[PDB]
Amino acid sequence: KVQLQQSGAELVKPGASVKLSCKASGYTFTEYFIHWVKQRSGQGLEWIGWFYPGSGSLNYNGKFKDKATFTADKSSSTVYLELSRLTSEDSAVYFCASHAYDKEPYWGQGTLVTVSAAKTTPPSVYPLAPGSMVTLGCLVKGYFPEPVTVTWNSGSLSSGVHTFPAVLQSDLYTLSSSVTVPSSTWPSETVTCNVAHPASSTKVDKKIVPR
């Protein structure tokens, strides 16, 4: 079976460089092309270039000539993509793909690259209480890195919940989560958001109380 193993998620300081790896198995390494593809969050696929380990031949999309460098280590069936001087625009998932000439390609699972200068930081969690149904919320602000896990009432409240994708602002993540319940349930019953952040090994609760 052709398999491509890509390296794990990278947290990269702004301005620094990073080297991503794609380790191949299940075929003669020197006889397949490797391509790299970029995908920014919520955007489409961009081709970076191709590299043929068996000769060292390569080609870059001109859009990436000052940003990407392909190399290989034949002794470990690995090809590398080095990205130089990272900016916010370089934050993306990077996929590698492999194929023999005139044959269909096999894709790796992708490597997430996130650019930020932040250190590990637990979230501040703030209650969102309103001024037949009622909508409540929690604002989960200023954490790093992803992910957090948000639940309501320790998971017993799952329907009517929207937890929104986090956004990076000033190098830290912010997200919100909403829950909608019958007015006959709140504030007469307890509604609490729970936020776990694995990187900081923290979990905090915030009960939503009327203003």
Binding site: H35, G44, L45, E46, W47, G49, W50, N59, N61, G62, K63, F95, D102, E104, P105, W107, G108, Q109, G110, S124, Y126, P127, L128, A129, P130, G131, T135, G137, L139, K141, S159, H162, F164, P165, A166, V167, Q169, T174, L175, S176, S178, T180, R211
Partner: protein, 216 residues
Amino acid sequence: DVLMTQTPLSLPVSLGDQASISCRSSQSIVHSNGNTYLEWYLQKPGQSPKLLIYKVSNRFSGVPDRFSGSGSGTDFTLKINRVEAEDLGIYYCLQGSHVPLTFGAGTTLELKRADAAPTVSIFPPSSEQLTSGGASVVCFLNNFYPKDINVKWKIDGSERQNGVLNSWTDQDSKDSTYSMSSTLTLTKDEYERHNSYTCEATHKTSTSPIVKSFNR
């Protein structure tokens, strides 16, 4: 470079529907060796794109036979015979005949449902955030359809643009709607110097915005 133009940008479908989506290249993509390297991919959130069709019309191993590709020259089409839920996602075409290799911008297949206006809710800063010296005003625009929507912030009657951050959910697994969150962030100082805060939701279901506000 070869421009790949996919249409439509989005296609609402019901399960069991026929679907047909198009990919047109700006120039011929017949390679000098005689082959046409045109591929179709389906991508779901958080996953790698999966290969469906290669060399115009060939189904990749393991791909259901309800998928078929055709075309010649600059004109290519992917068809689905009876859409199933696992077919929902974004479809990309890719030409591999001329470097640089280029992708289409994607066609989203999403589940059709009745149009629905957003449920809009606005929230002033928590006292906890204020005590900490910050101020975020949050607006939820929930369970609407279709996905296109616009939010506008107003402070004391005046439109605000800076300090607004938006986030959107994927189509809901249970009710097929979309939701959006909009957060206006301010310093505590500026927040206390104004009175009315307003978030306005413009959606196709109405001519006028849904307007939510509060006063300090």
